[PDB]
Amino acid sequence: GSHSMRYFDTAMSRPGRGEPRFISVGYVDDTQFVRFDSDAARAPWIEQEGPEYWDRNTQIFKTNTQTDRESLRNLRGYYNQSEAGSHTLQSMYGCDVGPDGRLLRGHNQYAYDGKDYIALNEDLRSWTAADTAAQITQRKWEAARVAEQDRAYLEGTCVEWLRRYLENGKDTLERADPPKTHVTHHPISDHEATLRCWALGFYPAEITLTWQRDGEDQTQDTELVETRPAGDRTFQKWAAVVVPSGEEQRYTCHVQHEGLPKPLTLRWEP
């Protein structure tokens, strides 16, 4: 099907405790495949890449570390901040491709202290700046033709390496694992009970779990936990509704997931 490659980069200053820590983590879909960490004292399909690959990536990481360190200094200035506080620069970049491996779209965006700062537009040619500080960055990047370089990476390197990773990791990356599901029932009081619909062991993380009553969505009355990692590549999620005792059969749990031959409809089975 369709796939993505995304890097999630975090630089954080720590005045009095050395230079800012830089970490970059790479993913294909919901699978982490590499991690670079400036404080350091990878996936199986990536291990086959060898020395040319690692040296070049290690080299790029070191240079990026230098650059993000000077960016942090500049950002402190743009916002009139003292040298005493910790600050965070983040970026997310990568590409989405279709089943045929062609570029669907590229991404390169940045945030400072948790707030959107600047992003490359979908056209891969212009920027959207969040505020007057980011407008200075935009000015600089327009002058230095940065979008052209980022576009080259996104259209070229990103798509070409995503294709290779998918080929090398096809047995896992191209495999969707369907959820294992069940419905549990717990009395709350004499007059109410909780019905909880479980989805376990699924990959990728994307899933839809809903409760219906008489076929109408119970969006407001459903408690839905955030999808959470099991630790073994797979994910988990549940949705719960409180229902009047005796009315359990008016409620159905619906599950949509890529790994399922077809959508599930589940009911409590006493």
Binding site: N57, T63, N64, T67, L75, Y110, K140, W141, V146, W161
Partner: peptide, 9 residues
């Protein structure tokens, strides 16, 4: 594969 940062912010 990592992208090199083109220019400081």
């Amino acid at each position: 594969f990592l992208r090199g940062r083109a220019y400081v912010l």
